[PDB]
From a paper:
Our structure and associated enzymatic and biophysical analyses reveal that while ADAT2 active site catalyses the deamination reaction, ADAT3 active site is inactivated by the replacement by a valine of the glutamate involved in proton shuttling during catalysis but also by the capping of its zinc-binding pocket and the loss of tRNA recognition determinants. Our results show that the ADAT3 N-terminal domain adopts a fold that shares similarity with the ferredoxin-like domains (FLD) of other tRNA-modifying enzymes, yet with an additional specific structural subdomain, containing V128, which forms a loose interface between ADAT3 N- and C-terminal domains. ADAT3 N-terminal domain is essential for tRNA binding and deamination by ADAT and can rotate with respect to the catalytic domain formed by ADAT2 and the ADAT3 C-terminal domain, without affecting the structure of this latter catalytic domain.
This hydrophobic core is located in the centre of ADAT3-N and is responsible for the tight interaction between the ADAT3-N FLD and the additional structural subdomain of ADAT3-N. This suggested that the V128M mutation would affect the overall folding of ADAT3-N. To test this hypothesis, we generated constructs bearing the V128M mutation but also the V128L or V128I mutations, those latter two substitutions having potentially a milder effect on ADAT3-N folding. Whereas the crystals with the V128I and V128M mutants, which showed stronger aggregation, did not diffract sufficiently, we were able to collect a full data set at 2.0 Å resolution for the V128L mutant. In details, however, we observed that the main chain of residues involved in the V128 central hydrophobic core and of their neighbours is moving away from the core by about 0.3–0.9 Å. We found that these movements are mainly propagated within the ADAT3-N specific structural subdomain but much less in the FLD, which displays a more stable fold due to its tighter packing.
Residue numbers in the entry:
A (entry chain B): 25 to 150, 162 to 237, 270 to 349
B (entry chain A): 14 to 174
């Protein structure tokens, strides 16, 4: 059992700010499609494509009514009438009730907490983060990383495993575990994998070895590995459990900084059940 | 054995600056560096990122690998060597290299100019002295040595890209 949690900068982790808008009840439900067409042609709401325009409501009985999102509120968010908000003949307002103010999420949700908060005000687009097909693929790649970590454990190496995947073809480009030794102490699993991707790449290649690729690593990368991924320009990282000195969520979030020339997505929790019994990085 | 390498700081940083200029001529970020153990150079490196097509091959990583080869060939343990080695580098180590230097337990870094884009000794993050109990040991810095020359190399490079 597992769930993928995004790891965002502290800025993007809080609550989305709210903006005020006008909605109106749809009293004649059979006007809904016409009203939606007429109003959204006048007020397309280009800055808020995450908002559905019709809010269904179920009554304490099962009866369903609907509100229609008309437009954003101006600088003076006073009471407004249908005649004040909707031009004729561009809109025939018959079937709408009196407009009311509603606060709306200004930007689309990214976390589950944000999605719940958002849809408490108004229906918002995304239920769950990953499709069944996606979760199956992610589990398969993390299982391969777990298996690499367990091979390392059986040999007496630090039990960290990693897999690099090209999500264009879902093919595995590299599989590695920690190989650090007394003679070679910096062979962390991510460093091994980056060097594997490097050696298998073409002649007219840029040094941004990981551009476009996904990384699955059993536990959260240390500062060295995390910043290697910034320099190599990984596109997404999935990890299982945090590390105490981890730099993709725990002590730092170097993937989500404005002053580094590359940002990327990070999710924790993938197969965390198994990964938490493996070794932290370093 | 650490302060004995410090005595020749001027000679060691001149060699680091010489290497930084080479790197610049070879279309690499102009960072040169030397690792000195008991007044002898046990490793050196300049940025080899574009040469090797590998974003992790910063000067400091190249020099660390040379010292490790030196330790392997002469049957010395990295611990005894790295813990008494000074790194001389023309530019503040980046976040990645600062973490590698902690993991190697290098006690002292003498560096030239600040690293505004990626610096891990204070410019972007303070990896060098951070409280990271599972990530090696913190190290100390002598910053600013020939920073003016060193940062002029950096600006020259970043114009040419
Ligand atoms: Zn690491
Ligand atoms: Zn570096």
């Amino acid at each position: 059992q597992w769930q993928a949690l995004p790891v965002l900068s502290e800025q993007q982790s809080g609550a989305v700010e709210l903006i005020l808008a006008y909605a109106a009840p749809v009293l004649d439900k059979r006007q809904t499609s016409r009203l939606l067409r007429e109003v959204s042609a006048v007020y397309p709401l280009p800055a808020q494509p995450h908002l559905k325009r019709v809010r269904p409501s179920r009554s304490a009985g099962g009866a369903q009514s609907s509100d229609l999102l008309l437009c954003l509120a101006g600088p003076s968010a006073g009471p407004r009438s249908l005649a004040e908000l909707l031009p004729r003949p561009a809109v025939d307002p018959r079937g709408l009730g009196t407009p009311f103010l509603v606060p709306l999420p200004a930007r689309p949700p990214l976390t589950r907490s944000q999605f719940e908060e958002a849809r408490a005000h108004w229906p918002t687009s995304f239920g769950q983060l990953f499709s069944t097909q996606e979760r199956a693929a992610m589990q398969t790649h993390m299982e391969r990383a777990v298996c690499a970590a367990q091979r390392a454990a059986a040999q007496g190496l630090r039990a960290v495993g990693a897999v690099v995947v090209d999500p264009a073809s879902d093919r595995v480009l590299a599989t590695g575990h920690d190989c650090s030794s007394v003679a070679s102490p910096l062979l962390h699993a991510v460093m091994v994998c980056i060097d594997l991707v490097a050696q298998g790449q073409g002649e007219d290649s840029l040094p941004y070895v990981c551009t476009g690729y996904d990384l699955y690593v059993t536990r959260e990368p240390c500062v060295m590995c995390a910043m290697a991924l910034v320099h190599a320009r990984i596109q997404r990282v999935f990890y299982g459990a945090p590390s105490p000195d981890g730099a993709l969520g725990t002590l730092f979030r170097v993937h989500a900084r404005p002053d580094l020339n590359h940002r990327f997505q990070v999710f924790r929790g993938i197969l965390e059940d198994q990964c938490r019994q493996l070794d932290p990085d370093p | 054995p650490c302060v004995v390498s410090v005595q020749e700081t001027e000679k060691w940083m001149e060699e680091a600056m010489r290497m930084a200029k080479e790197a610049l001529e070879n279309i690499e970020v102009p960072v040169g560096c030397l690792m000195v153990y008991n007044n002898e150079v046990v490793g050196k490196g300049r940025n080899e990122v574009n040469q090797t097509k590998n974003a992790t091959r910063h000067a400091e990583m190249v020099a660390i690998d040379q010292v490790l080869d030196w330790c392997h060939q002469h049957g010395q343990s990295p611990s005894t060597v790295f813990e008494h080695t000074v790194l001389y580098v023309t530019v503040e180590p980046c976040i990645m290299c600062a973490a590698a230097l902690r993991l190697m337990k290098i006690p002292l870094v003498v560096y030239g100019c600040q690293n505004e884009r990626f610096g891990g000794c204070g410019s972007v993050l303070n990896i060098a002295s951070a409280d990271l109990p599972n990530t090696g040991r913190p190290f100390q810095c002598i910053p600013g040595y020939r920073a003016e020359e060193a940062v002029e190399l950096l600006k020259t490079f970043y114009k040419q890209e």
